[PDB]
Scaffold this active site. Structure first.
Site, PDB file in Angstrom:
ATOM      1  N   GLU A   1      26.021  79.351   2.410  1.00  0.00           N
ATOM      2  CA  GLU A   1      27.097  79.738   3.312  1.00  0.00           C
ATOM      3  C   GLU A   1      27.592  78.512   4.065  1.00  0.00           C
ATOM      4  O   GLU A   1      26.798  77.794   4.683  1.00  0.00           O
ATOM      5  CB  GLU A   1      26.629  80.813   4.297  1.00  0.00           C
ATOM      6  N   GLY A   2      28.901  78.278   4.013  1.00  0.00           N
ATOM      7  CA  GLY A   2      29.510  77.179   4.736  1.00  0.00           C
ATOM      8  C   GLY A   2      30.708  77.631   5.543  1.00  0.00           C
ATOM      9  O   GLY A   2      31.625  78.253   4.997  1.00  0.00           O
ATOM     10  N   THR A   3      30.713  77.313   6.840  1.00  0.00           N
ATOM     11  CA  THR A   3      31.710  77.826   7.776  1.00  0.00           C
ATOM     12  C   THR A   3      31.777  79.345   7.675  1.00  0.00           C
ATOM     13  O   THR A   3      30.767  80.029   7.871  1.00  0.00           O
ATOM     14  CB  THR A   3      33.088  77.204   7.523  1.00  0.00           C
ATOM     15  OG1 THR A   3      33.617  77.686   6.282  1.00  0.00           O
ATOM     16  CG2 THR A   3      32.987  75.687   7.470  1.00  0.00           C
ATOM     17  N   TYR A   4      32.956  79.882   7.370  1.00  0.00           N
ATOM     18  CA  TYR A   4      33.112  81.304   7.103  1.00  0.00           C
ATOM     19  C   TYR A   4      33.166  81.620   5.615  1.00  0.00           C
ATOM     20  O   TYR A   4      33.277  82.793   5.247  1.00  0.00           O
ATOM     21  CB  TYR A   4      34.368  81.839   7.795  1.00  0.00           C
TER      22      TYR A   4
ATOM     23  N   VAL B   1      31.586  81.606   1.621  1.00  0.00           N
ATOM     24  CA  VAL B   1      30.299  81.822   0.971  1.00  0.00           C
ATOM     25  C   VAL B   1      30.483  81.666  -0.531  1.00  0.00           C
ATOM     26  O   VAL B   1      31.468  82.148  -1.101  1.00  0.00           O
ATOM     27  CB  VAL B   1      29.718  83.208   1.328  1.00  0.00           C
ATOM     28  CG1 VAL B   1      28.791  83.709   0.234  1.00  0.00           C
ATOM     29  CG2 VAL B   1      29.001  83.155   2.670  1.00  0.00           C
ATOM     30  N   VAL B   2      29.534  80.988  -1.174  1.00  0.00           N
ATOM     31  CA  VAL B   2      29.583  80.696  -2.602  1.00  0.00           C
ATOM     32  C   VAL B   2      28.527  81.533  -3.312  1.00  0.00           C
ATOM     33  O   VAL B   2      27.359  81.552  -2.903  1.00  0.00           O
ATOM     34  CB  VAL B   2      29.370  79.199  -2.876  1.00  0.00           C
ATOM     35  CG1 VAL B   2      29.855  78.839  -4.272  1.00  0.00           C
ATOM     36  CG2 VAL B   2      30.088  78.366  -1.828  1.00  0.00           C
TER      37      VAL B   2
ATOM     38  N   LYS C   1      33.418  81.261  -5.107  1.00  0.00           N
ATOM     39  CA  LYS C   1      33.405  81.119  -3.658  1.00  0.00           C
ATOM     40  C   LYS C   1      34.539  81.939  -3.063  1.00  0.00           C
ATOM     41  O   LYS C   1      35.669  81.893  -3.558  1.00  0.00           O
ATOM     42  CB  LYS C   1      33.546  79.654  -3.231  1.00  0.00           C
ATOM     43  CG  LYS C   1      33.680  79.472  -1.726  1.00  0.00           C
ATOM     44  CD  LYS C   1      34.112  78.064  -1.354  1.00  0.00           C
ATOM     45  CE  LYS C   1      34.303  77.937   0.151  1.00  0.00           C
ATOM     46  NZ  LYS C   1      34.870  76.618   0.539  1.00  0.00           N
TER      47      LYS C   1
ATOM     48  N   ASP D   1      34.518  66.367   5.365  1.00  0.00           N
ATOM     49  CA  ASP D   1      33.243  67.080   5.392  1.00  0.00           C
ATOM     50  C   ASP D   1      32.317  66.564   4.298  1.00  0.00           C
ATOM     51  O   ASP D   1      31.672  67.343   3.588  1.00  0.00           O
ATOM     52  CB  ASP D   1      33.447  68.589   5.260  1.00  0.00           C
ATOM     53  CG  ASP D   1      32.246  69.383   5.746  1.00  0.00           C
ATOM     54  OD1 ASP D   1      31.403  68.807   6.466  1.00  0.00           O
ATOM     55  OD2 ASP D   1      32.145  70.581   5.407  1.00  0.00           O
TER      56      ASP D   1
HETATM   57  C1  LIG Z   1      23.474  74.513  -7.429  1.00  0.00           C
HETATM   58  C2  LIG Z   1      24.428  74.531  -6.233  1.00  0.00           C
HETATM   59  C3  LIG Z   1      23.939  74.359  -4.943  1.00  0.00           C
HETATM   60  C4  LIG Z   1      24.770  74.364  -3.788  1.00  0.00           C
HETATM   61  O1  LIG Z   1      24.258  74.191  -2.534  1.00  0.00           O
HETATM   62  C5  LIG Z   1      26.186  74.552  -3.864  1.00  0.00           C
HETATM   63  C6  LIG Z   1      27.058  74.555  -2.588  1.00  0.00           C
HETATM   64  C7  LIG Z   1      27.297  75.711  -1.810  1.00  0.00           C
HETATM   65  C8  LIG Z   1      28.089  75.737  -0.644  1.00  0.00           C
HETATM   66  C9  LIG Z   1      28.741  74.619  -0.106  1.00  0.00           C
HETATM   67  C10 LIG Z   1      29.613  74.663   1.185  1.00  0.00           C
HETATM   68  C11 LIG Z   1      30.385  75.987   1.327  1.00  0.00           C
HETATM   69  C12 LIG Z   1      28.810  74.424   2.509  1.00  0.00           C
HETATM   70  N1  LIG Z   1      27.423  73.832   2.309  1.00  0.00           N
HETATM   71  C13 LIG Z   1      27.201  72.814   3.381  1.00  0.00           C
HETATM   72  C14 LIG Z   1      26.370  74.892   2.478  1.00  0.00           C
HETATM   73  C15 LIG Z   1      28.513  73.461  -0.871  1.00  0.00           C
HETATM   74  C16 LIG Z   1      27.720  73.435  -2.039  1.00  0.00           C
HETATM   75  C17 LIG Z   1      26.719  74.737  -5.190  1.00  0.00           C
HETATM   76  C18 LIG Z   1      25.854  74.726  -6.361  1.00  0.00           C
HETATM   77  N2  LIG Z   1      26.412  74.907  -7.650  1.00  0.00           N
HETATM   78  C19 LIG Z   1      27.784  75.102  -7.892  1.00  0.00           C
HETATM   79  O2  LIG Z   1      28.174  75.255  -9.089  1.00  0.00           O
HETATM   80  C20 LIG Z   1      28.647  75.113  -6.731  1.00  0.00           C
HETATM   81  S1  LIG Z   1      30.354  75.340  -6.855  1.00  0.00           S
HETATM   82  C21 LIG Z   1      30.532  75.221  -5.181  1.00  0.00           C
HETATM   83  C22 LIG Z   1      29.333  75.014  -4.556  1.00  0.00           C
HETATM   84  C23 LIG Z   1      28.173  74.941  -5.441  1.00  0.00           C
END
Ligand SMILES: Cc1cc(O)c(-c2ccc([C@@H](C)CN(C)C)cc2)c2c1[nH]c(=O)c1sccc12
EC number: 2.7.11.22
Length: 296
Positions: free
Chosen positions: A11-14, A16-17, A29, A123
């Site tokens: 979860e980042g800001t508002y 969620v992925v 996301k 960021d």
């Molecule tokens: C294996 C894996 C781990 C992760 O921590 C992230 C991921 C999830 C949230 C964010 C932002 C909102 C905020 N983050 C600071 C929490 C960034 C990265 C992702 C990931 N794999 C993906 O394919 C994608 S695609 C976008 C994201 C991801």
């Protein structure tokens, strides 16, 4: 709809992925929701930056989904194996200098794409950096990304996570452009070598003190406009002279490249383009092939 959420990731800001499947595992996301509905401006700004940022060193967007009376907006993206912060907490031995250079070159090339396209991310963090099993590095989140123009104006005062926040933002600078992004890149550089955060300040006061303790206390001579800074107008920090924590780990040109990255003066701060032209990446420990990255 059309996707089964296997597991939420972070979860980042508002926003969620999640992780879903198409037929093929994908990354999904949902953008930040807005109270006012009269198309979300924040959702559009994130969409605009990520589309213009499409690059081999940037996450691949497969589709963008809107609907439900514009209440819910989703972005379909190719699933990446890992995020950089996860490796830092799940690696027995530190990254090799050749691997670090390859990741930095991948990072710096992607950063240059944004600035050439008038894009500010603001960021840059390890948990926002995605690393594939094939060594390909991509940027994940655009929740803070914003466009900027040639005639500079005041933007969002409080930006960038505190640990990677630029000192000018820590000192409440009214105008900033491309300097905070390069500061975060320098902060990520130090973290890669030590697997630990470079400046893990507990607060804004602690963050400023941590930076000043090692990098010294900046002044007007080393930074024009220091007096005019809103924080420095009614404040005076402790003078910390001189500090290298990477003894026998970073090369002489590596220190020079890092110093250019972490330059107090935004004007004297090295750009993304000049970062790739530094001799550090062309030194005795040459960067390793991305396909030659070890197992996760
Ligand atoms: C294996 C894996 C781990 C992760 O921590 C992230 C991921 C999830 C949230 C964010 C932002 C909102 C905020 N983050 C600071 C929490 C960034 C990265 C992702 C990931 N794999 C993906 O394919 C994608 S695609 C976008 C994201 C991801």
């Amino acid at each position: 709809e059309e996707f089964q959420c296997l597991n939420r990731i972070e979860e980042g800001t508002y926003g969620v992925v999640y992780r879903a499947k198409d037929k093929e595992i994908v990354a999904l996301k949902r953008l930040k929701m807005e109270k006012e509905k009269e198309f979300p401006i924040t959702s559009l700004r994130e969409i605009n930056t990520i589309l213009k940022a499409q690059h081999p060193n940037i996450v691949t967007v497969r589709e963008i989904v809107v609907g439900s009376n514009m209440d819910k907006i989703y972005i379909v993206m190719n699933y990446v194996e890992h995020d950089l912060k996860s490796l830092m907490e799940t690696m027995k031995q530190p990254f090799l200098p050749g691997e670090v250079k390859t990741l930095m070159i991948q990072l710096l090339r992607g950063v240059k794409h944004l600035h050439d396209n008038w894009i500010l991310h603001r960021d840059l963090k390890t948990s926002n950096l995605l690393l594939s099993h094939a060594g390909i590095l991509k940027v994940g989140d655009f929740g803070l990304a914003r466009e900027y123009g040639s005639p500079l104006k005041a933007y969002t005062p409080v930006v960038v996570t505190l640990w990677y926040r630029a000192p000018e933002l820590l000192l409440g600078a009214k105008e900033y452009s491309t300097a905070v992004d390069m500061w975060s890149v320098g902060c990520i550089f130090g973290e890669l070598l030590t697997q630990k955060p470079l400046f893990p300040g507990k607060s804004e006061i602690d963050q400023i003190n941590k930076v000043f303790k090692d990098l010294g206390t900046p002044s007007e001579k080393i930074w024009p406009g220091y007096s005019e800074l809103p924080a420095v107008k009614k404040m005076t920090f402790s003078e910390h002279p001189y500090r290298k924590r990477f003894g026998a780990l970073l090369s002489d040109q590596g220190f020079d490249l890092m110093n250019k990255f972490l330059t107090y003066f935004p004007g004297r701060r090295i750009s993304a383009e000049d970062g790739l032209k530094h001799e550090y990446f062309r030194e005795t420990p040459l960067p390793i092939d991305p396909s030659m990255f070890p197992k996760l």
